[PDB]
Design an enzyme around this catalytic site. Structure first.
Site, PDB file in Angstrom:
ATOM      1  N   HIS A  55       0.760  -1.241   0.000  1.00  0.00           N
ATOM      2  CA  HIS A  55       0.000   0.000   0.000  1.00  0.00           C
ATOM      3  C   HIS A  55       0.788   1.288   0.000  1.00  0.00           C
ATOM      4  O   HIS A  55       0.199   2.361   0.023  1.00  0.00           O
ATOM      5  CB  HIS A  55      -0.930   0.040   1.206  1.00  0.00           C
ATOM      6  CG  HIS A  55      -1.939  -1.064   1.228  1.00  0.00           C
ATOM      7  ND1 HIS A  55      -3.200  -0.923   0.691  1.00  0.00           N
ATOM      8  CD2 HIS A  55      -1.876  -2.319   1.723  1.00  0.00           C
ATOM      9  CE1 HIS A  55      -3.871  -2.048   0.853  1.00  0.00           C
ATOM     10  NE2 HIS A  55      -3.091  -2.912   1.479  1.00  0.00           N
ATOM     11  N   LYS A  63      -8.483  14.244   4.317  1.00  0.00           N
ATOM     12  CA  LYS A  63      -7.673  13.023   4.359  1.00  0.00           C
ATOM     13  C   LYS A  63      -6.707  13.196   5.529  1.00  0.00           C
ATOM     14  O   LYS A  63      -6.601  14.288   6.080  1.00  0.00           O
ATOM     15  CB  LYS A  63      -6.867  12.879   3.065  1.00  0.00           C
ATOM     16  CG  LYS A  63      -6.117  14.154   2.676  1.00  0.00           C
ATOM     17  CD  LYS A  63      -5.454  14.036   1.298  1.00  0.00           C
ATOM     18  CE  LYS A  63      -6.474  14.100   0.168  1.00  0.00           C
ATOM     19  NZ  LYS A  63      -6.319  12.945  -0.756  1.00  0.00           N
ATOM     20  N   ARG A  64      -6.001  12.139   5.917  1.00  0.00           N
ATOM     21  CA  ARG A  64      -5.050  12.268   7.017  1.00  0.00           C
ATOM     22  C   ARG A  64      -4.022  13.357   6.689  1.00  0.00           C
ATOM     23  O   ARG A  64      -3.631  13.531   5.531  1.00  0.00           O
ATOM     24  CB  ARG A  64      -4.336  10.940   7.266  1.00  0.00           C
ATOM     25  CG  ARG A  64      -5.232   9.864   7.882  1.00  0.00           C
ATOM     26  CD  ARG A  64      -5.709  10.250   9.278  1.00  0.00           C
ATOM     27  NE  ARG A  64      -4.599  10.321  10.224  1.00  0.00           N
ATOM     28  CZ  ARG A  64      -4.234   9.323  11.023  1.00  0.00           C
ATOM     29  NH1 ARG A  64      -4.889   8.172  10.997  1.00  0.00           N
ATOM     30  NH2 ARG A  64      -3.202   9.471  11.840  1.00  0.00           N
ATOM     31  N   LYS A  98       0.966  14.387   1.275  1.00  0.00           N
ATOM     32  CA  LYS A  98      -0.363  14.703   0.770  1.00  0.00           C
ATOM     33  C   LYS A  98      -0.439  16.192   0.402  1.00  0.00           C
ATOM     34  O   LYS A  98      -1.361  16.641  -0.281  1.00  0.00           O
ATOM     35  CB  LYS A  98      -1.411  14.329   1.824  1.00  0.00           C
ATOM     36  CG  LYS A  98      -1.582  12.823   1.930  1.00  0.00           C
ATOM     37  CD  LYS A  98      -2.733  12.419   2.812  1.00  0.00           C
ATOM     38  CE  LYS A  98      -2.723  10.914   3.033  1.00  0.00           C
ATOM     39  NZ  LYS A  98      -3.551  10.212   2.019  1.00  0.00           N
ATOM     40  N   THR A 138      -8.401   6.768  -2.366  1.00  0.00           N
ATOM     41  CA  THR A 138      -9.752   6.246  -2.565  1.00  0.00           C
ATOM     42  C   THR A 138     -10.754   7.375  -2.336  1.00  0.00           C
ATOM     43  O   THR A 138     -11.866   7.353  -2.864  1.00  0.00           O
ATOM     44  CB  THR A 138     -10.065   5.039  -1.624  1.00  0.00           C
ATOM     45  OG1 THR A 138      -9.712   5.369  -0.275  1.00  0.00           O
ATOM     46  CG2 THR A 138      -9.288   3.797  -2.066  1.00  0.00           C
ATOM     47  N   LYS A 194     -14.463   8.734  -4.210  1.00  0.00           N
ATOM     48  CA  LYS A 194     -15.714   9.106  -3.549  1.00  0.00           C
ATOM     49  C   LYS A 194     -16.237  10.436  -4.087  1.00  0.00           C
ATOM     50  O   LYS A 194     -17.439  10.590  -4.330  1.00  0.00           O
ATOM     51  CB  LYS A 194     -15.507   9.205  -2.031  1.00  0.00           C
ATOM     52  CG  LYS A 194     -15.066   7.902  -1.403  1.00  0.00           C
ATOM     53  CD  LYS A 194     -14.600   8.095   0.031  1.00  0.00           C
ATOM     54  CE  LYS A 194     -13.710   6.935   0.463  1.00  0.00           C
ATOM     55  NZ  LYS A 194     -13.283   7.270   1.791  1.00  0.00           N
TER      56      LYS A 194
HETATM   57  C1  LIG Z   1     -11.971   7.277   2.030  1.00  0.00           C
HETATM   58  C2  LIG Z   1     -11.380   7.695   3.425  1.00  0.00           C
HETATM   59  C3  LIG Z   1     -10.003   7.913   3.585  1.00  0.00           C
HETATM   60  C4  LIG Z   1      -8.982   7.781   2.405  1.00  0.00           C
HETATM   61  O1  LIG Z   1      -8.843   9.065   1.776  1.00  0.00           O
HETATM   62  P1  LIG Z   1      -7.586   9.446   0.796  1.00  0.00           P
HETATM   63  O2  LIG Z   1      -7.901  10.826   0.299  1.00  0.00           O
HETATM   64  O3  LIG Z   1      -7.419   8.338  -0.158  1.00  0.00           O
HETATM   65  O4  LIG Z   1      -6.256   9.508   1.669  1.00  0.00           O
HETATM   66  C5  LIG Z   1      -9.530   8.421   4.772  1.00  0.00           C
HETATM   67  N1  LIG Z   1     -10.375   8.707   5.782  1.00  0.00           N
HETATM   68  C6  LIG Z   1     -11.717   8.463   5.676  1.00  0.00           C
HETATM   69  C7  LIG Z   1     -12.585   8.748   6.896  1.00  0.00           C
HETATM   70  C8  LIG Z   1     -12.251   7.967   4.497  1.00  0.00           C
HETATM   71  O5  LIG Z   1     -13.645   7.885   4.326  1.00  0.00           O
HETATM   72  O1  LIG Z   2      -4.846   0.940  -0.464  1.00  0.00           O
HETATM   73  C1  LIG Z   2      -5.689   1.792   0.278  1.00  0.00           C
HETATM   74  C2  LIG Z   2      -4.867   2.971   0.680  1.00  0.00           C
HETATM   75  O2  LIG Z   2      -3.700   2.523   1.432  1.00  0.00           O
HETATM   76  C3  LIG Z   2      -2.882   3.610   1.947  1.00  0.00           C
HETATM   77  O3  LIG Z   2      -3.698   4.486   2.686  1.00  0.00           O
HETATM   78  C4  LIG Z   2      -2.294   4.459   0.778  1.00  0.00           C
HETATM   79  O4  LIG Z   2      -1.658   5.606   1.315  1.00  0.00           O
HETATM   80  C5  LIG Z   2      -3.432   4.903  -0.194  1.00  0.00           C
HETATM   81  O5  LIG Z   2      -2.868   5.417  -1.361  1.00  0.00           O
HETATM   82  C6  LIG Z   2      -4.357   3.742  -0.610  1.00  0.00           C
HETATM   83  O6  LIG Z   2      -5.444   4.285  -1.334  1.00  0.00           O
END
Ligand SMILES: *Cc1c(COP(=O)(O)O)cnc(C)c1O
Ligand SMILES: OC[C@H]1O[C@H](O)[C@H](O)[C@@H](O)[C@@H]1O
Ligand SMILES: O=C(N[C@@H](Cc1ccc(F)cc1)C(=O)N1CCC(O)CC1)c1cc2cc(Cl)ccc2[nH]1
Ligand SMILES: O=C(N[C@@H](Cc1ccc(F)cc1)C(=O)N1CCC(O)CC1)c1cc2cc(Cl)ccc2[nH]1
Ligand SMILES: *Cc1c(COP(=O)(O)O)cnc(C)c1O
Ligand SMILES: OC[C@H]1O[C@H](O)[C@H](O)[C@@H](O)[C@@H]1O
Lengths: 815, 815
Positions: A354, A545-546, A551, A653, A657
């Site tokens: 990942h 996101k985190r 990022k 991911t 969304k």
């Molecule tokens: C989908 C999701 C993530 C992943 O987000 P990325 O922008 O891919 O880092 C992180 N936190 C929550 C609460 C999510 O729903």
């Molecule tokens: O594989 C699910 C997720 O794993 C880790 O959070 C990676 O940082 C992200 O890029 C990926 O989308």
């Protein structure tokens, strides 16, 4: 005793039909009998539980039936091992997959209650940090929906990801006591507790090695059902809890907690490795108990057929000890010979990578492994020796390659590279996005790819359309269904048909309307629970996101400051109003990440109170970003920020969304962004910045942030403002660390993408000025997001890695 | 929202009628929906839970109704504060008080299950050490049966009294994980959590004292229903659990357990004081949370009427901090003046004393109180000063009395005498048996009795006839009912009518038959779960209670050794066969008590394997004696041993259990034994040994065990056998500690009662040789045990201490 009498004990006619009359009856039964409350003392929380229990009943009838079915049919079983499962709320998702949403709504109305108010009472199940954990949750939903005999195995943390509070602009962490009021979705199984060993020593008997003098910790399973979409298939997620065995007196009893600490809390680290002993124990714990469960289930209907009935997917390297543990059991306990055991192991295990960030890679010091798991360390060395022998045979004389491929990493502190261990003991290794899987073959695992090319695959990530569309965006799902039907919900590719309405004025009006309502709603939610006035007519610029340096939330900060300086320069000039929303949690010990959050709030302190700026610019930091907040803010977003440095975000991911819910994307050619642009057409995407190859060039010659600072006036001004204390009056040098980092130690080249980013943001603003054309590009996005449904991803894992065939065949209802 | 719609939310027609058809339906529902099991994977434990849940449903309908009733009627409420509640199993007791026993039996038969087998699966709720805890449980049953608005308040220990294992003749302690499989009888109420403060400091503001900088621990209540006998009254037992508040990160979360340790384990000390900090915290914890609950319930339908609506009974001095805590709240928080607050306090609190043994008395060091509860220590000093002023006014110049009556005990270590604190702040102080209450007035509290004679009362203990007769001895209850009806069950005095059948040959035959069956059954239970062959035709000599020097199990040991030596001397002489059974737990750090257990097993090692002894003598140590074992062994007992040194057993209650179930008693004139002999007639009792006055004489002149050793040959021989290693071959001097104690440091004069004890035992053997006359004396016992029903005791507390009137009026059924 006549055993024919026990045939009466059946689930054959229990829950009653799924109509309003029976539901109210059960609601009542649960309110009184289950909760011991009456209409006089009952609170909304009590009403929420009565409803959850009522829905649970329908869920259980199918659960028992599904498990009976698998017993009878005996399919190949899939075990998804993950230390995280970010599930979020379960009530609504259950009502939707069971098609009970309506009856529940009507039944609660006739009782004088409001169902929407009740749903908001449910606590998020936050047993994950972010992307990795949420992916596991999406996959569970998809595997159930595709009718696979799959089990999710993890740890039942007592405290999930911490709750985030902002005090004086700073993040404050508060334990997430998510079980305080109980969890109606889990079913404890104390009767299935299994022993897990730690420490001890290895003794060599005439007939083999024996792991002795070990400390024992019991593993108690808790089962949670996972319903597929309207197919009556209910799978299981089994989470383990640590329990001390029953063998001064008072002190001895109090010291039991020591053993139970193993499953007490989730490490809040996202994409970062912390080599702490407790974490290693958690990893072995989940692995040892899971494998025992897998073997016993296997023997209850020799090991040559193991790979034919068992598939074990390792989510990252966290559960990597499953490889040597499987070898330990097969060789030490089952007494198979090393080679047969190894063959079975490689054929059973598969590994998913990942991240490529070096600081996220697990490299456990051997001194920790030899004291905690002495037998596993011996097995790892053996695995290593035999693997290195193969290497030497394929590349004679290549002593450097042998050093690079070794599972044992030399240096002052000897360490075990868990990623190398996973590649060696898996029949398949996959990346999570086309660009990431290619980077794995081209860089970090190049040596392994050259030895066994057939092992490397790609499985682009996806999200489940049930929670990420139907659930969070009913309005959008409604208008989409009114034109193409409901079949897309379990076949997202059908969204393609929407390309025929790109020119329909009715559709265009509708899409724009759903979004405005979603925005109006989100603005209301903000004033109500976090009192502040944002203009619902502005462009909703969202980056959630985190918090992480890679990022680049800082690149976002530079943009908003540029926008502010611009307005201040020419106050009476027109600009497309914007509400910039940034949210996300920072790992507790990640200093830089916590400084970034403070910067974001410091920026809003100035911008949000500048009278000349007015309603043209608002900077908001969304506190406590989690799965349930994502379900609220995402459907209300216009612009989705996916600006990681090219080559750092494996897939992402959240980007998917936003694409599914009508937001346009501004991002780099990174992770899955590359494939999204590919599906929607690059002209319907706001792409910018360096490509992976450009980053490599810069690296080769050397990154010098000063060059950009010297050549870009607007950037100079921003940095000057930051150092002078413009955003921190009482503390002039509060952000000295950030500035110094950007100037001299920036591994993610924020400055290098600044100019392109701003220009691109300008084009976003230009297009928003034209509603019809903005909405038409949006439609071109929503319509081609089909490829990013987790059902597609899972279908690919099933067929290409697990060797099992999906199926949408519905199982019969309990009765 | 139409509030008239919420009237549908009612318990009006839920559980269905109490017939077999509805019960099976619910059994099934629970097996599947509640337990998520099917007839294929279900185990007997699962079937036991399905039944418990089915019965619970009927219990809840009445619970909700009873609490609604009290809300409407607003009776004076009684709060019984105890740190112990030895409840035992709850299934059978619930079925019996609700009259569901039969339907449940039939319903489980038609399903192909055996109800008796299921009942044996239930875990004992061992939140008590012995007599003190069990009395609280009996009282709860009685208060419910007498329709009083009473609440039991205690602590929900995670681990109750330890499970006792015997290894090599020695006791081994194992944590009692009684919640492992869950507790269906408790209802967690996280919504009613309250804060409890510790440490901190006292600040003086212009308007009063303030307790600040305190550490907080949350108190979460768990409610357990307590059903009265067929009157549809269900009262509540609220037990508190400790929870940490939500305000390195990982360490911080792990350290939460530290606060939750407060309710982790029950101190296993019976009649012995251990001044440990954790114990003090437990005491304040239960008190602080309970009083808050009491005040809020009081304000929800000024404080002048407090004593009219609230009665707080202190079970021993364990909850004594309730006095200064009530003062703290009324004065510091409610701002009443000291004198009004004090008046209300004395009028509300009442204290029950349970022992005169000095080492059982709680005397807390002030240095512990000032660091943990600084404000309470200030209040205690104030209470003390004002109390001592009264004393000085009533007895001018008596400086010695002032020293003796002080709540503060001087010495190197200043200590607070909690017993003195209770007497000063209670309107009533009671002993638990006529002889004990008199001893309190004559000795230890003589000074207090002289100051306030009106405060001292007596409330002779009792036991509930439901569990201690109907439940454990259905056969006996059957034949008794077949002659005098079922009205005795809630009116034990009616057993008196049985005196008319002392001469009926049918009755005599029946009583003897019930006992033989009970014995046959117990002998079977012994071989099955603890493989060993006892002769069911022998006399069952039983002594079961906590191991304690004052209880004199050693005097019993001397007797069995005498019996053995006698047989060995004249092997071919006839003796009444005997099975001597001794059981009981010893506190972990009580060395002497643990040595006594080893002695008992050492004795059986020799006696039970001597071929010449044969089936004439068997010595058995019953391991893990608890409430559920008491229900098995007591109905099978012929002779009950109550041989404590005169003046040491405050009352005793096990003695009453044996009397109600057809066993004759051999004991001293101690505690309630005095009143039992009084009720049955001393000629129907086997009394022996020194009377309290004789003990005093011996003490005055000085106890010299050597005198007895020199004058009694049989005693010499026993001691010689013990010292020579006769009972411990491999370890000649293993019992040197016991022998030395008996010879030079025996506070309970075992040797002084030896001769009378043996002679008395001879008369017991003589009477057993004549079945008809033995059984006729038994009938004279069972027939006059009526006075020892807890219903009588509670009736007296209600009327003489609480100011409330009992009632057998049944409440209506849910529907
Ligand atoms: C989908 C999701 C993530 C992943 O987000 P990325 O922008 O891919 O880092 C992180 N936190 C929550 C609460 C999510 O729903
Ligand atoms: O594989 C699910 C997720 O794993 C880790 O959070 C990676 O940082 C992200 O890029 C990926 O989308
Ligand atoms: O939790 C459930 N049932 C209770 C039924 C119950 C309640 C109390 C009790 F003492 C025993 C069993 C239970 O088995 N546990 C309660 C908590 C206890 O610590 C362990 C058992 C449960 C049933 C169920 C069905 C579905 Cl479909 C999903 C989740 C579920 N949870
Ligand atoms: O325990 C009961 N109901 C469950 C109903 C339930 C089950 C799961 C859940 F998540 C919420 C509520 C419950 O409230 N707790 C279960 C354990 C949880 O930690 C706290 C709540 C219960 C009802 C009841 C009625 C009677 Cl009469 C006696 C004892 C009882 N216990
Ligand atoms: C009744 C009871 C007691 C009290 O017995 P005494 O002989 O009065 O000391 C102790 N333990 C249990 C389990 C009881 O049932
Ligand atoms: O009051 C109940 C019991 O309390 C203590 O256990 C006393 O030792 C005992 O004599 C009494 O019967």
């Amino acid at each position: 005793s006549d055993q024919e009498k026990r045939k009466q004990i059946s689930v054959r006619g229990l829950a009653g039909v799924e109509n309003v009359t029976e539901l109210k009856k059960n609601f009542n039964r649960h309110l009184h009998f289950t909760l011991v409350k009456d209409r006089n003392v009952a609170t909304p929380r009590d009403y929420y539980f009565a409803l959850a229990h009522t829905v649970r009943d329908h869920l259980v009838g199918r659960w028992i039936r599904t498990q009976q079915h698998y017993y009878e049919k005996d399919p190949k079983r899939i075990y998804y091992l993950s230390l995280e499962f970010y599930m979020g709320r379960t009530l609504q998702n259950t009502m939707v997959n069971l098609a009970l949403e309506n009856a529940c709504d009507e039944a609660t109305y006739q009782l004088g209650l409001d169902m929407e108010e009740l749903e908001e009472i449910e606590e998020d199940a936050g047993l994950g940090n972010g992307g990795l954990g949420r992916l596991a949750a999406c996959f569970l939903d998809s595997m159930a929906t595709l009718g696979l005999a799959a089990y999710g195995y993890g740890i039942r943390y007592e405290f999930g990801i911490f709750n985030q509070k902002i005090c004086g602009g700073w993040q404050m962490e508060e334990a997430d006591d998510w079980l305080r009021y109980g969890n109606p979705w889990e079913k404890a199984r104390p009767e299935f507790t299994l022993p897990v060993h730690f420490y001890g020593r290895v003794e060599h008997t005439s007939q083999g090695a024996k792991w002795v003098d070990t400390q024992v910790v019991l593993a108690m399973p808790y089962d949670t059902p996972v319903p597929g979409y309207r197919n009556n298939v209910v799978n299981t997620m089994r989470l383990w809890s640590a329990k001390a065995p029953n063998d001064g007196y008072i002190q001895a009893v109090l010291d039991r907690n020591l053993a139970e600490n193993i499953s007490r809390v989730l490490y809040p680290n996202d994409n970062f490795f912390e080599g702490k002993e407790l974490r290693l124990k958690q990893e072995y714990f989940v692995v040892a108990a899971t494998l025992q469960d897998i073997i016993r289930r296997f023997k209850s209907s020799n090991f040559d057929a193991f790979p034919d009935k068992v598939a074990i997917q390792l989510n990252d390297t966290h559960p990597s000890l499953a490889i040597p543990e499987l070898m330990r059991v097969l060789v030490d306990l089952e007494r198979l010979d090393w080679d047969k055991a190894w063959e079975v192991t490689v054929k059973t295990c598969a590994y998913t990578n990942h991240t490529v960030l070096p600081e996220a890679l697990e490299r456990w010091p051997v001194h920790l492994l030899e004291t905690l798991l002495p037998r596993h360390l011996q097995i790892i060395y053996e695995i290593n020796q035999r693997f290195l022998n193969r290497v030497a045979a394929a590349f004679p004389g290549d002593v450097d390659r042998l050093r690079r491929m070794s599972l044992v990493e030399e240096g002052a502190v000897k360490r075990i590279n868990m990623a190398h261990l996973c590649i060696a003991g898996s029949h398949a290794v996959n990346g999570v996005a086309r660009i990431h899987s290619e980077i794995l073959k081209k860089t970090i695992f190049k040596d392994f790819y050259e030895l066994e090319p057939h092992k490397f695959q790609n499985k682009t990530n996806g999200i489940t359309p049930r929670r990420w569309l139907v659930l969070c965006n009913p309005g959008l799902a409604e208008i989409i269904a009114e034109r193409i039907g409901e079949e897309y919900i379990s076949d997202l590719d059908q969204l393609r048909k929407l390309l025929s309405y790109v020119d329909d004025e009715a559709f265009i009006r509708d899409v724009a309307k759903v979004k405005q309502e979603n925005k109006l709603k989100f603005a209301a939610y903000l004033e109500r629970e976090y009192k502040v006035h944002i203009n619902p007519n502005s462009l909703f610029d969202v980056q959630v996101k985190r918090i992480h340096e890679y990022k680049r939330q800082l690149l976002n900060c530079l943009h908003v400051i540029t926008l502010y300086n611009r307005i201040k320069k020419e106050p009476n000039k027109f600009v497309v109003p914007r509400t910039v929303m940034i949210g996300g949690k920072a790992a507790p010990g990640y200093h830089m990440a916590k400084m970034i959050i403070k910067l974001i709030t410091a920026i809003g302190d100035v911008v949000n109170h500048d009278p000349v700026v007015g309603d043209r610019l608002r900077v908001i930091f969304l506190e406590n970003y989690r799965v349930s907040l994502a379900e609220k803010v995402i459907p209300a977003a216009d612009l989705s920020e996916q600006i990681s440095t090219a080559g750092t975000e494996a897939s992402g991911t959240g980007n998917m969304k936003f694409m599914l819910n009508g937001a346009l994307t501004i991002g780099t050619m990174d992770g899955a962004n590359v494939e999204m642009a590919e599906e929607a057409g690059e002209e319907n995407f706001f792409i910018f910045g360096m490509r992976v190859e450009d980053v490599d060039r810069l690296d080769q010659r050397g990154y010098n942030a000063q060059e950009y600072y010297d050549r870009i006036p607007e950037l100079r001004q921003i940095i000057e403002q930051l150092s002078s204390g413009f955003f921190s009056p009482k503390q002039p040098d509060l952000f000295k660390d950030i500035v110094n980092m950007l100037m001299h130690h920036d591994r993610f080249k924020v400055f290098a993408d600044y100019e392109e980013y701003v220009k691109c943001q300008e084009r976003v603003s230009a297009l928003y000025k034209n509603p019809r054309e903005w909405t038409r590009m949006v439609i071109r996005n929503i319509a081609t997001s089909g490829k990013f449904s987790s059902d597609r991803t899972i279908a690919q894992y099933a067929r290409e890695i697990w060797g099992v065939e999906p199926s949408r065949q519905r199982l019969p209802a309990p009765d």
